[PDB]
Protein backbone atom coordinates (compact mmCIF):
# COMPACT_ATOMS: atom_id res chain seq x y z
CA UNK A 1 0.00 0.00 0.00
CA UNK A 2 2.96 2.16 -0.04
CA UNK A 3 2.49 3.67 3.95
CA UNK A 4 5.97 3.98 5.68
CA UNK A 5 6.02 2.67 9.30
CA UNK A 6 7.85 5.27 11.00
CA UNK A 7 8.45 3.60 14.35
CA UNK A 8 10.35 0.89 12.78
CA UNK A 9 13.81 0.33 13.72
CA UNK A 10 16.28 -2.53 13.27
CA UNK A 11 19.93 -2.90 12.37
CA UNK A 12 22.22 -5.02 9.59
CA UNK A 13 22.86 -7.64 12.39
CA UNK A 14 19.87 -7.99 13.76
CA UNK A 15 19.28 -10.75 16.97
CA UNK A 16 22.77 -12.28 15.74
CA UNK A 17 25.39 -10.75 17.80
CA UNK A 18 27.63 -10.62 14.61
CA UNK A 19 29.80 -7.37 14.07
CA UNK A 20 30.51 -6.54 10.65
CA UNK A 21 33.98 -7.38 10.13
CA UNK A 22 32.90 -11.65 11.18
CA UNK A 23 29.77 -10.93 7.79
CA UNK A 24 30.32 -13.51 5.11
CA UNK A 25 30.58 -10.22 2.26
CA UNK A 26 30.26 -10.75 -1.44
CA UNK A 27 29.35 -9.46 -4.60
CA UNK A 28 26.00 -9.38 -6.40
CA UNK A 29 26.24 -12.12 -9.55
CA UNK A 30 26.30 -9.91 -12.32
CA UNK A 31 25.00 -10.58 -15.87
CA UNK A 32 25.16 -7.78 -18.21
CA UNK A 33 22.53 -5.01 -16.64
CA UNK A 34 20.87 -7.52 -14.06
CA UNK A 35 22.53 -7.67 -10.41
CA UNK A 36 21.47 -10.62 -8.75
CA UNK A 37 21.04 -11.38 -5.01
CA UNK A 38 20.07 -14.88 -4.67
CA UNK A 39 19.99 -16.23 -0.93
CA UNK A 40 17.95 -19.59 -1.92
CA UNK A 41 21.78 -21.31 -0.83
CA UNK A 42 23.72 -18.85 1.16
CA UNK A 43 20.63 -19.17 4.15
CA UNK A 44 19.87 -22.99 4.70
CA UNK A 45 21.29 -24.22 8.05
CA UNK A 46 24.55 -25.55 8.71
CA UNK A 47 26.55 -26.74 11.62
CA UNK A 48 28.27 -23.24 11.88
CA UNK A 49 25.07 -20.69 11.65
CA UNK A 50 23.72 -18.39 12.48
CA UNK A 51 26.15 -16.49 9.62
CA UNK A 52 25.89 -12.77 8.55
CA UNK A 53 25.32 -13.23 4.41
CA UNK A 54 25.83 -9.68 3.27
CA UNK A 55 24.96 -9.51 -0.49
CA UNK A 56 27.15 -6.13 -1.88
CA UNK A 57 25.26 -4.58 -5.34
CA UNK A 58 28.00 -1.87 -6.54
CA UNK A 59 26.65 0.31 -8.79
CA UNK A 60 28.26 2.81 -10.98
CA UNK A 61 26.44 2.88 -14.54
CA UNK A 62 23.09 3.22 -15.57
CA UNK A 63 19.48 1.64 -15.51
CA UNK A 64 21.02 -1.54 -13.46
CA UNK A 65 18.30 -3.91 -12.94
CA UNK A 66 18.93 -5.26 -9.01
CA UNK A 67 16.64 -8.52 -8.53
CA UNK A 68 16.49 -9.76 -5.17
CA UNK A 69 15.42 -13.66 -4.18
CA UNK A 70 14.46 -14.65 -0.87
CA UNK A 71 13.34 -17.99 0.14
CA UNK A 72 9.75 -18.66 1.04
CA UNK A 73 8.70 -20.46 4.44
CA UNK A 74 8.14 -23.91 3.17
CA UNK A 75 9.31 -23.82 -0.35
CA UNK A 76 11.53 -26.66 0.39
CA UNK A 77 10.30 -28.47 4.01
CA UNK A 78 12.40 -27.54 7.14
CA UNK A 79 15.01 -25.51 5.72
CA UNK A 80 13.07 -22.11 5.68
CA UNK A 81 10.29 -23.11 8.44
CA UNK A 82 11.34 -19.57 10.45
CA UNK A 83 12.39 -17.13 7.94
CA UNK A 84 11.41 -13.15 7.57
CA UNK A 85 11.63 -10.52 5.06
CA UNK A 86 12.15 -7.00 6.08
CA UNK A 87 10.62 -4.51 4.41
CA UNK A 88 7.29 -6.32 3.79
CA UNK A 89 6.84 -4.06 1.21
CA UNK A 90 10.14 -3.93 -0.48
CA UNK A 91 10.72 -2.77 -2.83
CA UNK A 92 9.10 -0.12 -2.74
CA UNK A 93 10.22 0.64 1.24
CA UNK A 94 13.39 0.18 1.69
CA UNK A 95 15.74 0.34 4.84
CA UNK A 96 18.42 3.43 5.02
CA UNK A 97 20.84 4.09 8.41
CA UNK A 98 19.78 7.06 10.27
CA UNK A 99 22.01 7.39 12.71
CA UNK A 100 23.57 4.48 13.62
CA UNK A 101 20.33 1.99 13.32
CA UNK A 102 18.23 0.49 10.09
CA UNK A 103 14.65 3.17 9.37
CA UNK A 104 12.03 2.51 6.35
CA UNK A 105 12.43 5.13 3.29
CA UNK A 106 10.00 5.27 0.08
CA UNK A 107 13.12 3.82 -2.54
CA UNK A 108 11.20 6.75 -5.17
CA UNK A 109 11.81 9.52 -2.74
CA UNK A 110 15.26 8.43 -2.17
CA UNK A 111 16.40 7.92 -6.06
CA UNK A 112 14.63 10.32 -9.37
CA UNK A 113 13.80 8.30 -12.59
CA UNK A 114 13.15 4.71 -10.37
CA UNK A 115 11.61 2.00 -12.12
CA UNK A 116 9.08 -0.53 -10.14
CA UNK A 117 6.68 -2.49 -12.19
CA UNK A 118 4.11 -3.59 -10.02
CA UNK A 119 4.78 -7.35 -11.24
CA UNK A 120 7.90 -9.76 -11.56
CA UNK A 121 6.97 -12.94 -14.25
CA UNK A 122 3.05 -12.48 -13.95
CA UNK A 123 3.12 -11.91 -10.27
CA UNK A 124 2.91 -9.68 -7.10
CA UNK A 125 6.16 -7.55 -7.01
CA UNK A 126 6.85 -8.42 -3.44
CA UNK A 127 9.07 -11.00 -1.30
CA UNK A 128 6.05 -12.70 -0.58
CA UNK A 129 6.41 -14.37 -4.18
CA UNK A 130 9.91 -14.83 -3.23
CA UNK A 131 11.50 -12.36 -5.61
CA UNK A 132 11.82 -8.37 -5.84
CA UNK A 133 13.42 -6.35 -8.93
CA UNK A 134 13.58 -2.67 -9.76
CA UNK A 135 15.85 -0.41 -12.34
CA UNK A 136 18.17 1.99 -11.05
CA UNK A 137 17.51 5.10 -13.11
CA UNK A 138 20.21 6.77 -15.97
CA UNK A 139 21.59 9.44 -13.76
CA UNK A 140 22.47 9.21 -9.94
CA UNK A 141 24.77 12.44 -8.29
CA UNK A 142 24.60 11.28 -4.61
CA UNK A 143 25.92 8.36 -3.00
CA UNK A 144 22.70 6.32 -1.82
CA UNK A 145 23.03 3.62 0.32
CA UNK A 146 20.02 1.37 1.38
CA UNK A 147 19.08 -2.22 2.41
CA UNK A 148 16.78 -5.56 2.43
CA UNK A 149 16.84 -8.72 4.98
CA UNK A 150 16.32 -12.22 4.04
CA UNK A 151 16.93 -13.64 7.90
CA UNK A 152 16.92 -16.88 8.09
CA UNK A 153 18.87 -17.24 11.05
CA UNK A 154 15.73 -18.18 13.87
CA UNK A 155 15.30 -21.67 11.69
CA UNK A 156 16.81 -24.04 13.81
CA UNK A 157 17.20 -28.09 12.69
CA UNK A 158 18.81 -29.56 15.65
CA UNK A 159 22.22 -28.18 15.61
CA UNK A 160 21.94 -26.45 11.98
CA UNK A 161 21.00 -22.96 12.24
CA UNK A 162 20.00 -21.06 9.30
CA UNK A 163 22.29 -17.71 8.32
CA UNK A 164 20.91 -13.91 8.27
CA UNK A 165 21.05 -12.19 4.38
CA UNK A 166 21.48 -8.70 4.15
CA UNK A 167 21.38 -6.73 0.70
CA UNK A 168 23.47 -3.28 0.82
CA UNK A 169 22.83 -1.50 -2.54
CA UNK A 170 25.98 1.24 -2.79
CA UNK A 171 25.15 3.34 -5.37
CA UNK A 172 27.72 5.70 -6.71
CA UNK A 173 27.53 8.94 -8.88
CA UNK A 174 26.99 8.12 -12.28
CA UNK A 175 26.01 9.03 -15.70
CA UNK A 176 28.13 12.09 -16.52
CA UNK B 1 40.21 -7.77 13.37
CA UNK B 2 38.86 -4.19 13.54
CA UNK B 3 41.54 -1.76 14.79
CA UNK B 4 41.26 2.31 15.20
CA UNK B 5 44.74 4.14 15.70
CA UNK B 6 44.00 7.67 16.24
CA UNK B 7 46.91 11.00 15.53
CA UNK B 8 49.18 11.03 19.13
CA UNK B 9 48.77 13.27 21.83
CA UNK B 10 48.78 17.22 21.28
CA UNK B 11 49.74 20.56 23.18
CA UNK B 12 47.69 23.30 21.41
CA UNK B 13 47.68 27.03 22.73
CA UNK B 14 43.97 28.83 23.61
CA UNK B 15 42.22 30.14 20.38
CA UNK B 16 43.98 27.15 18.08
CA UNK B 17 42.09 24.69 16.40
CA UNK B 18 43.20 21.04 16.46
CA UNK B 19 42.61 17.95 13.81
CA UNK B 20 42.63 14.51 15.29
CA UNK B 21 43.03 11.78 12.87
CA UNK B 22 41.30 7.73 12.86
CA UNK B 23 42.75 5.53 10.66
CA UNK B 24 40.44 2.42 10.41
CA UNK B 25 41.77 -1.01 9.15
CA UNK B 26 39.92 -4.45 8.91
CA UNK B 27 35.88 -4.33 8.51
CA UNK B 28 34.07 -1.47 5.92
CA UNK B 29 34.87 2.07 6.26
CA UNK B 30 32.07 3.94 3.76
CA UNK B 31 28.71 2.63 5.56
CA UNK B 32 29.47 3.06 9.25
CA UNK B 33 29.70 5.08 11.27
CA UNK B 34 32.41 7.14 12.92
CA UNK B 35 31.58 8.21 16.58
CA UNK B 36 33.24 11.01 17.97
CA UNK B 37 33.45 11.09 22.16
CA UNK B 38 35.91 13.06 24.64
CA UNK B 39 36.38 12.70 28.32
CA UNK B 40 38.06 15.69 30.15
CA UNK B 41 40.53 14.39 32.93
CA UNK B 42 38.61 12.73 35.54
CA UNK B 43 35.06 13.72 34.29
CA UNK B 44 32.15 11.70 32.15
CA UNK B 45 31.87 10.91 28.64
CA UNK B 46 30.54 13.86 26.32
CA UNK B 47 29.11 12.85 22.71
CA UNK B 48 30.23 14.81 19.99
CA UNK B 49 29.25 13.88 16.42
CA UNK B 50 29.62 11.47 13.73
CA UNK B 51 29.71 10.81 10.19
CA UNK B 52 28.94 7.96 8.25
CA UNK B 53 31.78 8.49 5.54
CA UNK B 54 29.59 8.22 1.82
CA UNK B 55 27.47 10.96 3.35
CA UNK B 56 30.30 13.74 3.16
CA UNK B 57 27.96 15.34 6.06
CA UNK B 58 28.84 14.86 10.04
CA UNK B 59 26.09 15.04 12.59
CA UNK B 60 27.26 17.54 15.84
CA UNK B 61 26.23 18.15 19.40
CA UNK B 62 24.48 21.41 19.43
CA UNK B 63 26.78 22.41 22.82
CA UNK B 64 29.82 22.45 20.30
CA UNK B 65 27.96 25.20 18.42
CA UNK B 66 29.67 24.32 14.90
CA UNK B 67 33.16 24.77 16.54
CA UNK B 68 33.53 20.90 15.49
CA UNK B 69 33.74 19.84 12.05
CA UNK B 70 33.69 15.65 11.37
CA UNK B 71 35.24 14.83 7.89
CA UNK B 72 36.28 11.50 6.48
CA UNK B 73 39.11 10.72 3.36
CA UNK B 74 36.79 7.26 2.68
CA UNK B 75 40.25 7.04 0.06
CA UNK B 76 42.29 6.13 3.01
CA UNK B 77 39.52 5.22 5.67
CA UNK B 78 40.91 7.84 7.71
CA UNK B 79 38.40 9.78 9.63
CA UNK B 80 39.11 14.14 11.16
CA UNK B 81 37.63 15.69 14.32
CA UNK B 82 38.64 19.56 14.29
CA UNK B 83 38.09 21.60 17.40
CA UNK B 84 38.45 25.77 17.27
CA UNK B 85 38.22 28.51 19.58
CA UNK B 86 40.14 25.85 21.91
CA UNK B 87 40.31 26.83 25.71
CA UNK B 88 41.28 25.40 28.96
CA UNK B 89 38.00 23.21 29.35
CA UNK B 90 38.80 21.74 26.10
CA UNK B 91 41.99 19.52 27.32
CA UNK B 92 40.63 15.75 26.74
CA UNK B 93 41.38 12.74 25.59
CA UNK B 94 38.79 12.70 22.59
CA UNK B 95 38.04 9.03 21.05
CA UNK B 96 37.05 8.06 18.05
CA UNK B 97 34.50 4.38 17.74
CA UNK B 98 32.43 2.75 14.97
CA UNK B 99 29.59 0.77 15.13
CA UNK B 100 29.77 -2.28 13.14
CA UNK B 101 25.86 -3.06 11.90
CA UNK B 102 25.03 -3.50 16.28
CA UNK B 103 23.86 0.14 16.40
CA UNK B 104 26.67 0.54 19.59
CA UNK B 105 29.82 2.09 18.98
CA UNK B 106 31.95 -1.29 19.90
CA UNK B 107 35.37 -0.47 18.33
CA UNK B 108 36.81 1.94 20.25
CA UNK B 109 40.74 4.49 19.25
CA UNK B 110 43.32 4.65 21.79
CA UNK B 111 42.27 8.13 22.19
CA UNK B 112 44.03 11.32 21.76
CA UNK B 113 44.88 13.85 24.63
CA UNK B 114 44.68 16.94 23.59
CA UNK B 115 46.07 19.43 26.76
CA UNK B 116 45.07 23.17 25.91
CA UNK B 117 47.90 25.37 27.29
CA UNK B 118 49.43 28.71 27.04
CA UNK B 119 16.09 21.08 24.39
CA UNK B 120 14.33 17.39 23.69
CA UNK B 121 17.80 15.72 24.68
CA UNK B 122 17.66 12.61 26.57
CA UNK B 123 18.79 13.02 30.32
CA UNK B 124 20.51 9.35 31.41
CA UNK B 125 20.88 9.83 35.64
CA UNK B 126 23.12 6.85 36.74
CA UNK B 127 23.29 6.20 40.47
CA UNK B 128 24.76 5.13 43.13
CA UNK B 129 27.46 7.95 42.01
CA UNK B 130 29.91 5.52 43.96
CA UNK B 131 30.14 2.29 45.32
CA UNK B 132 33.05 0.86 47.61
CA UNK B 133 32.52 -3.14 47.74
CA UNK B 134 34.61 -6.63 48.82
CA UNK B 135 35.49 -9.31 46.34
CA UNK B 136 32.46 -11.61 46.05
CA UNK B 137 29.85 -9.03 46.63
CA UNK B 138 26.84 -8.35 44.48
CA UNK B 139 27.08 -4.59 42.81
CA UNK B 140 24.13 -3.15 41.00
CA UNK B 141 24.48 0.26 38.97
CA UNK B 142 21.20 1.95 38.06
CA UNK B 143 20.30 4.43 34.82
CA UNK B 144 17.19 6.35 34.54
CA UNK B 145 16.12 7.82 31.19
CA UNK B 146 14.27 11.14 30.48
CA UNK B 147 12.02 9.75 27.91
CA UNK B 148 11.21 6.28 26.78
CA UNK B 149 14.67 5.10 24.91
CA UNK B 150 13.06 1.05 24.40
CA UNK B 151 15.85 -1.28 25.19
CA UNK B 152 18.18 1.02 23.47
CA UNK B 153 21.14 1.21 25.97
CA UNK B 154 24.75 0.24 26.69
CA UNK B 155 26.96 0.00 29.58
CA UNK B 156 30.57 0.96 29.15
CA UNK B 157 33.28 -0.77 31.38
CA UNK B 158 36.24 1.84 31.62
CA UNK B 159 39.61 1.68 33.76
CA UNK B 160 42.04 4.23 34.38
CA UNK B 161 44.12 5.60 30.91
CA UNK B 162 41.64 3.13 28.85
CA UNK B 163 39.07 3.30 26.09
CA UNK B 164 35.38 2.93 27.17
CA UNK B 165 34.57 -1.02 26.94
CA UNK B 166 31.50 -2.27 25.70
CA UNK B 167 29.72 -4.81 28.21
CA UNK B 168 25.89 -4.82 27.06
CA UNK B 169 23.79 -3.05 24.40
CA UNK B 170 20.13 -3.68 23.56
CA UNK B 171 19.55 -3.16 27.57
CA UNK B 172 20.60 -6.85 28.44
CA UNK B 173 23.05 -8.36 25.09
CA UNK B 174 26.55 -9.31 26.78
CA UNK B 175 29.05 -8.54 24.21
CA UNK B 176 31.21 -11.26 23.22
CA UNK B 177 33.73 -12.35 26.04
CA UNK B 178 32.00 -10.79 28.79
CA UNK B 179 32.00 -13.54 31.65
CA UNK B 180 28.04 -14.72 32.95
CA UNK B 181 28.59 -12.77 36.46
CA UNK B 182 27.28 -9.48 33.85
CA UNK B 183 23.84 -8.82 32.98
CA UNK B 184 21.13 -6.10 32.49
CA UNK B 185 17.80 -5.63 32.65
CA UNK B 186 14.98 -2.92 32.01
CA UNK B 187 12.83 -1.46 28.88
CA UNK B 188 11.90 2.14 28.60
CA UNK B 189 13.07 4.84 31.26
CA UNK B 190 14.55 2.21 34.06
CA UNK B 191 17.97 0.47 33.42
CA UNK B 192 20.56 -1.84 35.88
CA UNK B 193 23.24 -3.39 35.27
CA UNK B 194 24.40 -6.37 38.19
CA UNK B 195 27.47 -8.26 38.99
CA UNK B 196 26.39 -10.91 40.83
CA UNK B 197 29.96 -11.65 42.71
CA UNK B 198 32.70 -8.86 41.97
CA UNK B 199 36.39 -10.17 41.17
CA UNK B 200 39.71 -8.08 41.14
CA UNK B 201 38.75 -7.53 37.15
CA UNK B 202 35.44 -5.79 38.14
CA UNK B 203 36.83 -2.47 39.90
CA UNK B 204 36.68 0.52 37.27
CA UNK B 205 34.18 3.42 36.48
CA UNK B 206 31.07 2.35 34.71
CA UNK B 207 28.58 4.49 32.27
CA UNK B 208 25.25 3.97 30.79
CA UNK B 209 24.43 5.84 27.72
CA UNK B 210 21.26 5.76 25.61
CA UNK B 211 21.41 5.29 21.39
CA UNK B 212 17.93 5.61 20.99
CA UNK B 213 18.73 9.44 19.52
CA UNK B 214 21.55 11.71 18.77
CA UNK B 215 22.37 13.80 20.65
CA UNK B 216 23.88 9.92 22.47
CA UNK B 217 23.87 10.98 26.12
CA UNK B 218 25.61 9.28 29.14
CA UNK B 219 25.48 8.85 32.74
CA UNK B 220 27.96 10.72 34.84
CA UNK B 221 29.05 7.25 35.76
CA UNK B 222 29.42 5.25 39.08
CA UNK B 223 32.91 4.26 40.11
CA UNK B 224 33.21 1.00 41.69
CA UNK B 225 36.23 0.72 44.01
CA UNK B 226 37.30 -2.17 46.33
CA UNK B 227 36.25 -1.43 50.46
CA UNK B 228 39.15 -0.15 52.43
Known amino acids: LDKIDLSYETTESGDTAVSEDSYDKYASQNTNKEYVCDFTDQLKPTESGPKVKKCEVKVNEPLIKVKIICPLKGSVEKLYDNIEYVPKKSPYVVLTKEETKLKEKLLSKLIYGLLISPTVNEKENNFKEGVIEFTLPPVVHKATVFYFICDNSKTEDDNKKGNRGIVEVYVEPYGN | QVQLVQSGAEVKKPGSSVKVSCKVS????????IIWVRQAPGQGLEWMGAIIPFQDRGQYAQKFQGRVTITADKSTSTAYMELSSLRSEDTAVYYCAKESGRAVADRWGQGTLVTVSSGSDIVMTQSPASLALSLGERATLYCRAS??????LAWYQQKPGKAPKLLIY???TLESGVPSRFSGSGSGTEFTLTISSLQPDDFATYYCQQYKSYPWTFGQGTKLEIKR
Open chain 2, 170 to 172: KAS
Open chain 2, 26 to 33: GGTFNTYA
Open chain 2, 147 to 152: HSISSW
